[PDB]
């Protein structure tokens, strides 16, 4: 009966030295019942990455929606949408459904391809932008993620160090939440290569 915690799941994003990382777990459940172990919550539109936690039907719907909108954007503008711009589009689109919202906690991450700046942002279900230097957290284990991130994080981590830090924040937060876990994916994003790593974690 709380749509934001029927399916479960989490997303975390972090900035480093000339890089960003964004990670999610793979669980999709129906309350106590785990249903799928392959439900990824991170998508990309060109070089801009979007993670979405919350009600899985809305997660899927919003991905399909932002693919639609960024495809038309590209055709008309003749360039890939940038993270700062995509962030605004996410905000507009969610607030447009102000009194019948999508029950989601989106997170944007990527590098602006003109300025080279790493960029992350988070949103509430009705579109409020939370831009941050350091980290953004989302999902049913968000309290835990806030705790992990606030203690583990330090600025200017190298991509391979940032990887360890974001992974440890995700893993240990997931393990204190009954509705998150069942696998995890971490994206390390540099100006023009992106590595995707699947983490080994406890399957309970």
């Amino acid at each position: 009966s709380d749509p934001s915690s029927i399916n479960g799941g989490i997303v975390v994003a972090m900035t480093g030295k000339d890089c960003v990382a964004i990670a999610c777990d793979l669980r999709l459940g129906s309350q106590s019942l785990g249903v799928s172990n392959k439900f990824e919550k991170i998508f990309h539109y060109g070089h801009v990455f979007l993670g979405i936690t919350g009600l899985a039907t809305d997660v899927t719907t919003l991905n399909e929606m932002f693919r639609y909108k960024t495809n038309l954007y590209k055709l008309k503008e003749e360039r890939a949408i940038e993270p700062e711009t995509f962030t605004q589009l996410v905000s507009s689109s969610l607030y447009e459904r102000r009194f019948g919202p999508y029950f989601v906690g989106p997170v944007v991450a990527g590098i602006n391809s003109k300025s080279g700046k790493p960029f992350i942002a988070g949103f509430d279900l009705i579109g409020c932008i939370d831009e941050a230097k350091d980290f953004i957290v989302s999902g049913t284990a968000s309290d835990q993620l806030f705790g992990m991130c606030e203690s583990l994080y330090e600025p200017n981590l190298e991509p391979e160090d940032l990887f360890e830090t974001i992974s440890q924040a995700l893993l240990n937060a997931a393990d204190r939440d009954a509705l998150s876990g069942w696998g995890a994916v971490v994206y390390i994003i540099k100006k023009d290569e992106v590595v995707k790593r699947y983490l080994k974690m406890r399957q309970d």
Binding site: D124, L125, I126, C128
Partner: peptide
């Protein structure tokens, strides 16, 4: 939804 967050408040201020």
């Amino acid at each position: 939804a967050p408040a201020x």
